[PDB]
């Protein structure tokens, strides 16, 4: 807001103090004849610093003024060593600038003037941020490599440019090229810069150097969705075994893709990132064949078993709620509006007969089953990234919120049964609904409508937490009208609107056409009802056909196939969670070993494919 | 109708009187040998004027007869000075014609015959109108420039063609080129004609000369939706500050785009025009970045505050209507069809207890709030273009009609309470509905379904004020049938149709399936009912599935993305109204100044963008 406004005030102040100076102006427009006049006249202030803290040499280099920049370097050689001093462009020298503008003849000069190639452009304008349109890094080489100047990138290496130099974020130049928008020019520079990693004594060669998040360039390529570079960095891991005409048997490596157990593997990093370009990586030729093997072999069995153990558990919860304790009421009917006939038994008479002891079994089976839920779900939360990283791994798993809410209500139900509290129907009735509707989750195993509850969970897009605001306002408006219309009338005839809370429920039901329009026809209703209700039935009918449309254009001219892509992302998110929770004995590690084959101690995957 | 018919009768009469003349015919077909015979024979009527008032020279020039036209100019030189005299092609000379037909060798001659280049083609066929297929202006240069003849446009300037000459509408030649259908040939002529604005003493140079609507060529380009020329006229306003490799920092001017406060700025002229090509301008690179800054900074706050102050106001109106004065009725039940139990209290007993004084507070809060509405909305109307320009600024604001109707009903409610009038439910029940459903407007702030109440307000297209005619006819037809079928029967059994007004309401409800089909089954209904109602349920079911379709094809094969364009047009229309109503202190002017930067007294905007 104001910081963006404060950039502008400096960029204009920058152009102001150029005009308010004879030196900084002559550099901008390359008036050498009027520049020699100024440098010769007096041992002037050559350290004139404009708004961004920049000397005349920055400005000669910022506007591609080769001829001006030499004169500054001839007059006072101290200028090449001068960085900008402002908080915005801090540390930046004239060398960084000439590289970005690709001024080949100027950059050669500043190196001939022994300019530092290790100078670190720390300013805020270079850090990675959506406020900045560029992330070229922090060093001259990182700037050269991202503008695609093969010549300058070489030229800086003869002068001692450490390729292993990292940013504040730890990203060496190999990470940055993955973060650029132009992919095709970035793969060619990736190859060139490793070629200058010649010397055998390097202690974790460049493409295995992680940043301050632990990510290598390979894993960074997946998190950012750079499909081009993920492929290009993958031929280092292939090993073509044999080729028999149209057949090929490649042997992928999977050391950074498969869950080892020490650091989060690439499949965990693609699910735990907000981007949707990263989910394209799950279609690539080493990964697609691994996800479909964890699942087809060891992910559908352990998910269509724990989806049937849950069903036989909720069927036991259910029968413990149908057959609950209930006795005839002991009070008397207070008002004629009280049709309560029964109330729930106290403990001393709830468990007093054989049929109530079969139930106690099922009720202990239940509440033990709810504690278990809170011992395999809450310890994840309380130990893991309690609320930010939890829902981050969640792609289509609101399940984990509901089933913890299930187990909570079951325990509320227990306590209330122990202290003989009135109102056990309130917790149960949540637990029933939350308990069964979680069985909608144990469906994706077979490609049920679980690939299509992707929709109803994708249907927490805009027009379904947002059509509330323009439906609820209709309900509150006509319900408050309907109420005052029948506020004078006899409710034993038409009693849809006898109190304000029932006027909203009735009006909610009338919006959806799940009760019939009020009518008696043996009594004169108000004339002000039929006018009002005719409009409600119209606003309600049209708002239920702008949303059918809105749910359509957000599905057909918009996404209908990335839902099939979203399925493959839930197959992973499921597979990862099971492999994290289930023990190693039930989960054989995917891929074949290498110790008994001479390939090392890595865990390869073989893929046999036909070219054409 | 008849005026178009009267053009034709002259165009045929024009060809008639050519055939009924030996002179006008010889010109049409270029018979010089039979033309010299006619001019030499006798000092003839060379002033023969056909239907449109045209002499032989117009016709030689209208049909590209170079050889005939010279003979007329050699015989009698007085012809070049002769305009057409008819009301349709008034003022037009032979010079105007040769320019349009691009006859390069003929036009040189008429200038050699000292023909006026200031002659003003005033006729109705040249004025701007949908009845005319061309608007080439009123002068020879304006005709040359719109046919794209670089040669003739130059050639008229050596002979003294004032470029600053304006039409009856004030449009100089620079405005006209924007109004042409061919854009690409018009940008090149725009450049050429300013080049001939050399002399420094001009007193508002050409591209700052307004027409009789005050619009300059820049502002005219936006009103007309000429995206090509809006861009082309915008490089005069850019000022590229610096270029750092792929980065560019341009400094746009915004003097004619932003609301200064003296004349309506370009953002006000694009909303207040009926065209939809003009709304394309809101996506261009100086304007898109300004709308999104007024809003993101100073338009969502002042719109999500006055949208919550309104909600707490209607919640107070509501509670003042639930808790209204009501007492048991004093009369007796007239007929058994009267289930009115209560009636409303008189003033003397309406405010008699502490609970009725808390309400008086909320009722004064209310009616003060309705006067305020009528002091910030009616003074706009009564002062502004009361009914034509009001709804012109309205793009998606029927809100302004409803909220004035709200405040009116609240004051009707007041008066009726002061004079103890019966029927306060009628005004309230409008005010409730109009009051809440206006909260659907204070939603666009967050990109609610307010971008999608664009639909339901776009849904006042054809098939929703127009499907009425083919639904209402079904209702009136079967309701008048249902009525006469049960006009003989006992209504205490089936009384959906006991009077004609309830027969239309019931039938309205049955069309929409918001009440159940009539039935008793303990009594023999007419056989003529089941035949009729079976057809109604079919016509009703099919007419509710031709419109689902009609609302679809008008959304999916038709517009689904210009609604996203329509949002950005309401962001402006909202932003303009707030900036007009709210004071200057709460509204800092957008864009940075120039006085403290040497750029002048203009109000620039900086945009930093990455090329590729
Ligand atoms: C974790 C370890 C334990 C934690 C603490 C344990 C708590 C222990 C104590 C709790 C409550 C205090 C004692 C009982 C109150 C009696 C007063 C009364 O009249 O109650 C009435 C209402 O019912 C209630 O008031 C019961 C409240 C249910 C639990 C809290 C709400 C949970 C859902 C909140 C929403 C969350 C949203 C979730 C969204 C998914 C009685 O019920 P009734 O229906 O009026 O009529 C009888 C019904 N019956 C005869 C048919 C059966
Ligand atoms: C701005 C400054 C002030 C202006 C002048 C102030 C005017 C002052 C005086 C006005 C009316 C004259 C006195 C009362 C008439 C009594 C006769 C009678 O039987 O009435 C009946 C009908 O109700 C009416 O006749 C009331 C009329 C309401 C106001 C006018 C209509 C506004 C909406 C028009 C549409 C516009 C379309 C809008 C589209 C959005 C009585 O009501 P009831 O329902 O039959 O039964 C009682 C109801 N109750 C007990 C439940 C409460
Ligand atoms: C996105 C989803 C939104 C939420 C869903 C929204 C819909 C539903 C949600 C919530 C509605 C809750 C209303 C009922 C609770 C109030 C008290 C009550 O029960 O009735 C009392 C009256 O109370 C009133 O008259 C106050 C009603 C004012 C409006 C309340 C909603 C405010 C907006 C907030 C929501 C923003 C909505 C979004 C758009 C702005 C008593 O009534 P009674 O017993 O008949 O006695 C009457 C007295 N008499 C007999 C003397 C005459
Ligand atoms: C469009 C804008 C809004 C329309 C009118 C605004 C409102 C009306 C305007 C003003 C107030 C009413 C007039 C004075 C009193 C008359 C008698 C009366 O109150 O009610 C009587 C009949 O009602 C009528 O005879 C109403 C006559 C008005 C026109 C009919 C409205 C419907 C048609 C237009 C439809 C438009 C769509 C048509 C198709 C496109 C009986 O009704 P009640 O409730 O039994 O009365 C006694 C109640 N009490 C015992 C409690 C006392
Ligand atoms: C775009 C939206 C259009 C508007 C909505 C359209 C639908 C609704 C709008 C309006 C309908 C209004 C009808 C009711 C008012 C009339 C009087 C009345 O109430 O009943 C009286 C009878 O009256 C009649 O019998 C006359 C009905 C003739 C047709 C009226 C509509 C004309 C078309 C105009 C519209 C063009 C529609 C467009 C297509 C052409 C009395 O009835 P009763 O009390 O039972 O007494 C009967 C006497 N008996 C007992 C002796 C037997
Ligand atoms: C398609 C064109 C239109 C159809 C026929 C046109 C009309 C009929 C033609 C002519 C008039 C009726 C015939 C004479 C009198 C018979 C008895 C009578 O009136 O009603 C009796 C039964 O009704 C019948 O028995 C009707 C017999 C005709 C054929 C059945 C029609 C439905 C089938 C075809 C469906 C087509 C779709 C099939 C699937 C595609 C009893 O009825 P009521 O009302 O209780 O009578 C007493 C009333 N009163 C006490 C007031 C006196
Ligand atoms: C008390 C004893 C004798 C009987 C009750 C045992 C089972 C019938 C219940 C109680 C514990 C339950 C489990 C506890 C928690 C979970 C984790 C949760 O599964 C997942 O989160 C897998 C999907 C994913 O992680 O994406 C929901 C099912 C499951 C296996 C439950 C399935 C049903 C179980 C095995
Ligand atoms: C007493 C209860 C029944 C009152 C009304 C229900 C509410 C308590 C709401 C709050 C949140 C709702 C739940 C939110 C999300 C879902 C997931 C949805 O299922 C899925 O998307 C697939 C299953 C999964 O992913 O877990 C089914 C409806 C359900 C259970 C909803 C059911 C109704 C709930 C429990
Ligand atoms: C009597 C006092 C003590 C309390 C009542 C004050 C407020 C709760 C009310 C009454 C005056 C109302 C305002 C009067 C008129 C308007 C203009 C109108 O807004 C617009 O037209 C903005 C959108 C646009 O112009 O496109 C509707 C809301 C607003 C600000 C109203 C919002 C709610 C306000 C501030
Ligand atoms: C006593 C009343 C309730 C009888 C029936 C209602 C009618 C008086 C009609 C006449 C015009 C209608 C209104 C015309 C347009 C709109 C805007 C529409 O909202 C929007 O398009 C967004 C809000 C806005 O832009 O103001 C919601 C329905 C509503 C309020 C309509 C509600 C019903 C109204 C008030
Ligand atoms: C909206 C388009 C697409 C279709 C046309 C529908 C409406 C404009 C019409 C159809 C019939 C009309 C109704 C016919 C009769 C009445 C009864 C009238 O009240 C009375 O006559 C009181 C006494 C009684 O109802 O017997 C109030 C207006 C109302 C509801 C009318 C309101 C407007 C309605 C719903
Ligand atoms: C989308 C616009 C909603 C709308 C606006 C209306 O004006 C009306 C509506 C619906 O339905 C009918 C025609 C039945 C009403 C009749 C009575 C009144 C007072 C109003 C009519
Ligand atoms: C703006 C007022 C006119 C109008 C036009 C309509 O097309 C419709 C209106 C009202 O309300 C009802 C509910 C009667 C129609 C039913 C059929 C459909 C799907 C649309 C509805
Ligand atoms: C779009 C055409 C509407 C239509 C036309 C009809 O001919 C009939 C219709 C509907 O529905 C059935 C078949 C139930 C009627 C049975 C009775 C009569 C007398 C007619 C039948
Ligand atoms: C022309 C007469 C034949 C006919 C054909 C139909 O297809 C339909 C007809 C009538 O009416 C009903 C309402 C029974 C059908 C219901 C299902 C749909 C959506 C269409 C309706
Ligand atoms: Ca029903
Ligand atoms: Cl559909």
| DSSP structure class, residue A489 | B
Angle ∠(B304,B306,B311) on CA atoms, nearest 5: 95
Distant-in-sequence, close-in-space partners of B166: CB < 8 Å, separation ≥ 6: B172, B209, B211
Instruction: Enter the DSSP assignment of A344.
Output: P
Residue A454 and residue A511: Cα distance in Å, rounded?
27
Q: Which helix (H) or strand (E) holds B607?
A: strand B605-610
Question: Which token pair is A314?
Answer: 């909720």
Q: What's the CA gap between A522 and A172, in Å, rounded?
A: 85
Is B64 labelled a binding residue?
A: no
**Atom number, ligand 2, closest to the C-alpha of residue A528:** 44
Q: Two tokens at B45?
A: 């009527």
d(CA B39, CA B75): 7
Is the Cβ atom of A326 under 6 angstroms away from ligand 1?
no
The total of other beta-carbon atoms located within 10 Å of residue B99's CB is: 31
Pocket test for ligand 5, best of B472, B475, B496, B509 (most atoms within 8 A of CB): B472
- Locus of tokens 């049964």: A417
Non-local CB neighbours of B29 within 8 Å, separated by 6+ positions = B63, B65
Are B175 and B220 in contact by the 8 Å Cβ rule? The answer is yes
Strands, E, within B214-356: which ranges?
243-244, 247-252, 327-328, 342-343
Residue owning tokens 């994840």? A380
Tokens of A373: 């839920």
If one residue of A467, A510, A527, A535 were mutated to test the ligand 10 pocket, choosing by the most ligand atoms within 8 A of its CB, it would be A535
A489 in Cβ contact with B337 (< 8 Å): no
Shortest Cα–Cα distance, A330 to chain B (Å): 36
Closest CA to B56 of B88, B90, B89, B17: B17
- Containing A236, the helix (H) or strand (E) segment is none
Q: Hey, what are B109's tokens? A: 């001659």
Is residue A518 within 6 Å of ligand 4 at its C-beta?
Answer: no
The H or E element that residue A117 is part of is none
> The domain B1-241: what is its CATH number?
1.25.40.20
Answer yes or no: are the C-beta atoms of B417 and B347 closer than 8 Å.
Answer: yes
Beta bridge partners of A248: A243, A609
How long is chain A? 612
Nearest to B51 by CA among B78, B99, B83, B84: B84
- Token duo for residue B610: 């990455």
CB B409: neighbour CB atoms within 10 A? 21
Does A422 sit in the ligand 1 pocket, CB within 6 Å?
yes
Return d(Cα B463, Cα B456) in angstroms, integer.
12
> Which class for B537: exposed (0-12), middle (13-18), buried (19 or more C-beta within 10 A)?
middle
* Contact status, residue B155 vs residue B116, Cβ threshold 8 Å: no
| CB of A440 shorter than 6 A to ligand 8 | yes
The structure was resolved to a resolution in Å of 2.8
Q: Which of A137, A148, A225, A239 is nearest to A187 (CA)?
A: A148
What number does the ligand 3 atom closest to the CA of B324 have? 52
Please report where in the chains the tokens 């229309």 appear, as a residue: B573
E strands, B253-391, in order: 327-328, 342-343
- Partner residue facing B449 (CB), from A62, A463, A549: A463
- Count CB neighbours of B317 within 10 A: 24
Separation CA B144–CA A502 (nearest Å) = 76
Sheet with B247-252, edge to edge strand ranges = B243-244, B247-252, B605-610
Residue owning tokens 């005050």: B214
With b for 16 or more beta-carbon neighbours within 10 A and e for fewer, the B118-127 pattern comes to: ebbbbbebbb
* Collapsed DSSP state (helix, strand, coil) of residue B519: coil
Q: What is the dihedral of CA A271, A273, A274, A276, to 10 degrees?
A: -60
Question: Looking at the DSSP assignment, which residues form a beta bridge with residue B252?
Answer: B605
Take residue A536 and report the two structure tokens written for it: 């409600």
3-state secondary structure B17-56: HHHCCHHHHHHHHCCHHHHHHHHHHCCCCCCCCCCCCCCH
Q: How far apart are CA A297 and CA A590, in angstroms?
A: 10
Question: Tokens representing A417?
Answer: 């049964």
Distance B318 CA to ligand 2 centre (A): 18
**Is residue A586 a contact partner of residue A297, using CB atoms and an 8 Å limit?**
no
Tokens matching residue A126: 């270079």
Q: Please report how many Cα atoms fall inside a 13 Å half-sphere around the Cα of residue A516, on the Cβ side.
A: 10
List the determination method. cryo-EM
Picking from B398, B312, B435, the residue whose alpha carbon sits closest to that of residue A484 is B435
Distance B410 CA to ligand 9 centre (A): 14
Q: Which residues of A touch B515 (CB under 8 A)?
A: 516-517, 519
- Calculate the alpha carbon distances from A554 to A30, B361, B440 in Å: 56, 47, 21
B454, with CB counted inside 10 A (0-12, 13-18, 19+), is buried
Question: Residue B582, SS3?
Answer: coil
State the burial class of residue B429 (Cβ atoms within 10 Å of its Cβ: 0-12, 13-18, 19+).
buried
Could you list the beta-strand ranges (E) of A268-401. 327-328, 342-343
Q: How far is CA B401 from CA A532, A564, A578, B407, in A?
A: 19, 47, 59, 10
């Amino acid at each position: 807001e104001s910081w963006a406004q404060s950039r502008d005030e400096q960029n204009l102040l920058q152009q102001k103090r150029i005009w308010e100076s004879p030196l900084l102006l002559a550099a901008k427009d390359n008036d050498v004849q009027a520049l020699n006049k100024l440098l010769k006249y007096e041992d002037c202030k050559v350290h004139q610093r404009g708004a961004m803290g920049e000397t005349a040499l920055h400005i000669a280099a910022l506007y591609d003024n080769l001829e001006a920049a030499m004169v500054l370097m001839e007059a006072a050689p101290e200028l090449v060593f001068e960085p900008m001093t402002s908080e915005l462009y801090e540390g930046q020298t004239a060398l960084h600038i000439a590289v970005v503008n690709q001024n080949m003849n100027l950059v050669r000069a500043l190196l001939a003037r022994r300019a530092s190639v290790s100078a670190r452009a720390t300013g805020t304008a270079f850090r990675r941020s959506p406020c900045n349109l560029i992330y070229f890094g922090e060093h001259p080489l990182s700037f050269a490599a991202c503008v695609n100047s093969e010549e300058i990138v070489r030229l800086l290496i003869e002068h001692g440019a450490d390729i292993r130099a990292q940013d504040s974020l730890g990203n060496t130049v190999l990470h940055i090229l993955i973060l650029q928008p132009n992919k095709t020019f970035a793969c060619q520079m990736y190859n060139l810069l490793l070629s200058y990693d010649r010397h055998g004594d390097h202690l974790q060669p460049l493409d295995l150097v992680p940043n301050h998040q632990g990510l290598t360039p390979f894993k960074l390529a997946g998190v950012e969705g750079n499909t081009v570079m993920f492929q290009h960095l993958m031929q280092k891991r292939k090993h073509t075994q044999w080729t028999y005409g149209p057949l090929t048997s490649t042997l992928y490596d999977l050391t950074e893709i498969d869950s080892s157990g020490d650091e989060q593997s690439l499949l965990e990093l693609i699910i735990t990132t907000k981007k949707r370009e990263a989910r394209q990586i799950l279609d690539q030729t080493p990964v697609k064949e691994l996800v479909s093997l964890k699942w087809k072999r060891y992910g559908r069995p352990y998910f269509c078993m724990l989806g049937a153990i849950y069903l036989l558990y909720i069927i036991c919860f259910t029968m413990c709620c149908i057959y609950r304790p209930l006795k005839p009421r002991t009070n008397n009917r207070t008002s004629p509006r009280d049709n309560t006939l029964l109330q729930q038994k106290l403990l001393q008479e709830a468990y007093m007969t054989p049929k109530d002891d079969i139930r106690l079994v099922g009720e202990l089976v239940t509440v033990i089953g709810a504690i278990i839920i809170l011992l395999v779900e809450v310890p994840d939360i309380f130990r893991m990234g309690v609320t930010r990283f939890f829902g981050q791994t969640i792609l289509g798993g609101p399940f984990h919120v509901l089933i913890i809410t299930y187990a909570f209500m079951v325990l509320v139900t227990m306590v209330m049964r122990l202290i003989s509290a009135s109102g056990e129907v309130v917790p149960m009735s949540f637990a029933l609904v939350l308990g069964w509707c979680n069985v909608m989750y144990f469906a994706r195993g077979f490609q049920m409508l679980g690939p299509f509850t992707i929709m109803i969970q994708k249907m927490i897009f805009g027009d379904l937490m947002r059509f509330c605001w323009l439906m609820a306002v209709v309900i509150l408006g006509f319900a408050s009208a309907f109420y005052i219309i029948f506020q004078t009338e006899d409710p034993e005839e038409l009693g849809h609107f006898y109190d304000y809370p029932m006027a909203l429920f009735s009006t909610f039901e009338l919006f959806l056409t799940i009760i019939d329009g009020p009518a008696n026809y043996n009594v004169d209703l108000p004339f002000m009802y039929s006018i009002t209700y005719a409009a409600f039935a119209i606003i309600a009918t049209l708002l239920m056909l702008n949303l059918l449309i809105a749910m359509m254009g957000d599905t057909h001219w918009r996404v209908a196939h990335e839902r099939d892509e979203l399925w493959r992302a839930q197959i992973v998110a499921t597979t990862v969670m099971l492999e994290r929770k289930l023990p190693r004995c039930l989960w054989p590690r995917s891929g074949i070993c290498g110790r008994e084959y001479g390939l090392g101690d890595r865990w390869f995957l073989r893929v046999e494919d036909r070219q054409d």
